[PDB]
DNA sequence: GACCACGGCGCG
DNA sequence: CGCGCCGTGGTC
């Protein structure tokens, strides 16, 4: 609150003000440093930017990433917003932070720098006297902020000419589903109105109507309710491709090739560090842990997404992980066992009912061993099963009889969440769960979902979170890159060369991250794209 | 132009 | 279960 001349002294908390929110794109509008009570602001933010040792605020991954941009090696240190988002993963902004500790989230360069200066002495003392939480922020999230920067920074590179044509071809496709679906309809509407869909499936055809929509009551026309119509009508069929191919046209094909950077000439996301609840990351600006890969004209948006000139792509997937976390957390023989001997868990588990071994089709094990995670509900395996309900209602009890111990640990772990309030991951990570004890029901039941699947999602973002920490410094040392995280994998770009010797190493730093009751497998490849890397 | 709610759907 | 983005339909 002092007006001293620029530049700050060492260990200065920064505030800048951006023009847009993704650094790689934004004009830096306004620099500015507090220490010991005092805020200097930068005459000129970009020269000034050069001033800085490291970038100790909020978002200060952000201003480390324009830093990059500008060849500026930058690193981002202490961020309040780390601490909160420790403190409470409700914590996802500035604006609400500010706010619960005692500041105001402006838009000028200095207050910010000082509403980071205040926010981090009242949050760093709240986390005295929490041992673990302060583990995970200097042993995971504060270094994790910088490998994120780097990421960020570097981007991926895509094959536009590719996408250019393949939206030509799309497009001709969709003409041609659009032109059927209006002949068998008898007249043309917007086919992408779903309202206007309703009154055509529903009213105009004589179609049967499945179920509602949750917030105003219209008639759903959800895949999930078209898959079930699929027979009773031949446009239905029609319409489901349609909505495929629209949804990747739109959401990827049509935008992603403008999107890439002058500078760079490759495509920049955003690693947001402090957006979910369970501790996972999260892409955005585009998102880029959701591109298509499940159906065939998926597997083709994938192949745009390439190695630059000289270089290869290593792909590395941990296999079941959320499910080996369960069996570590829960402490199951049988599940144990299963990992343990190496064996296939889907159909070793399609061998407890079954077999065994290998003698109930895979994926009616492989289902339910996903099911079970998010407290899935006998009448949604039916659907996802195309099973009577019966059927669906005796295949998850034959689970809890194989795989005693993962329900007493469901058991034990929402005891203890009404008791203090909040579940926990392997290392502490913690969500806070009130509605445990609500006195209705589904309201009841739905936070149990959440409360009892967190420390098992969580722990296994954890993991992947430790993982990447511990390689960035081995790969910068072979010049190799990492692009990409998505949850449970990871896509590299290394040297023609180095290729597969980063992809030998990667693999054991990531299966041996943290050791647990149970191995850690991860399946790698190397390709001069994400399709062919994969596999 | 910005923003919003909704339904719907892509990924893990 | 956990996210983020799309078009539609709409307000300001
Ligand atoms: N495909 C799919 N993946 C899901 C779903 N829900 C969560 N996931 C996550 C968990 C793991 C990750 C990838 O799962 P995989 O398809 O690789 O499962 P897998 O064990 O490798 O199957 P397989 O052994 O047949 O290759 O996606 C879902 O509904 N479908
Ligand atoms: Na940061």
């Given at each position: 609150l002092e007006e001293a001349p620029?530049?700050?002294?060492?260990?200065a908390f920064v505030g800048f003000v951006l023009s847009r929110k993704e650094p790689m794109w934004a004009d830096l509008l306004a620099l500015a440093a507090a220490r010991g009570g005092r805020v200097h602001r930068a005459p000129e933010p970009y020269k000034a930017?050069?001033?800085?040792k490291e970038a100790r605020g909020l978002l200060a991954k952000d201003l480390s990433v324009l830093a990059l941009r500008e060849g500026l090696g930058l690193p981002p240190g202490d961020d309040p917003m780390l601490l909160a988002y420790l403190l409470d993963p409700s914590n996802t902004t500035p604006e609400g932070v500010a706010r619960r500790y005692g500041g105001e989230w402006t838009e000028e360069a200095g207050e910010r720098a000082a509403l980071s200066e205040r926010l981090f002495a009242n949050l760093w003392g709240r986390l005295e006297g929490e041992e673990r939480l302060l583990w995970l922020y200097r042993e995971v999230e504060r270094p994790l902020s910088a490998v994120l920067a780097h990421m960020e920074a570097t981007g991926v590179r895509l094959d536009v000419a590719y996408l250019r044509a393949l939206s030509l071809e799309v497009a001709e496709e969709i003409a041609r589903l659009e032109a059927e679906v209006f002949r068998l309809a008898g007249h043309p509407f917007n086919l992408n109105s779903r309202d206007q869909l309703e009154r055509v499936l529903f009213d105009e055809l004589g179609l049967p109507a499945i179920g509602k929509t949750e917030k105003t009551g219209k008639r759903s026309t959800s895949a999930a309710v078209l898959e079930a119509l699929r027979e009773a009508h031949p446009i239905v069929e029609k319409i489901l491709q349609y909505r495929e191919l629209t949804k990747l046209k739109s959401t990827y094909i049509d935008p992603l090739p403008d999107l890439i950077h002058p500078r760079t000439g490759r495509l920049h996301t955003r690693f947001n560090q402090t957006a979910t609840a369970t501790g996972r990351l999260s892409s955005s600006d585009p998102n880029l842990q959701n591109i298509p890969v499940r159906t065939p004209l998926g597997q083709r948006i994938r192949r745009a997404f390439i190695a630059e000139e000289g270089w290869l792509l290593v792909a590395l997937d941990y296999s079941q992980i959320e499910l080996r976390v369960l069996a570590h957390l829960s402490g199951d023989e049988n599940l144990i066992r299963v990992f343990q001997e190496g064996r296939d868990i889907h159909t070793e588990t399609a061998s407890w009912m079954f077999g065994v071994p290998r003698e109930l089709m895979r994926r009616a094990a492989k289902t339910i061993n996903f099911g079970v995670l998010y407290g899935m509900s006998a009448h949604r395996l039916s659907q996802e099963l195309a099973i009577p309900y019966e059927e669906a209602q005796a295949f998850i009890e034959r689970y809890f009889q194989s795989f005693p111990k993962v329900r007493a640990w469901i058991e034990k772990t929402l005891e203890e969440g009404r008791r203090r309030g909040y579940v926990e991951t392997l290392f502490g990570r913690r969500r806070y769960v009130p509605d445990l004890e609500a006195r209705v029901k589904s309201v009841r039941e739905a936070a149990e979902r959440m409360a009892f699947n967190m420390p098992v999602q969580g722990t296994a973002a954890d993991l992947m979170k430790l993982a990447m920490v511990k390689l960035f410094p081995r790969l910068e040392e072979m010049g190799a890159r990492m692009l990409l995280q998505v949850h449970d994998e990871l896509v590299l770009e290394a040297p023609k060369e180095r290729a597969e010797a980063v992809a030998r190493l990667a693999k054991e730093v990531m299966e041996g991250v943290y050791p647990l009751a149970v191995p850690l497998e991860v399946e790698v490849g190397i390709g001069e794209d994400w399709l062919s890397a994969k596999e």
């Open positions: 620029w530049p700050p002294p060492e260990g930017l050069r001033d800085l």
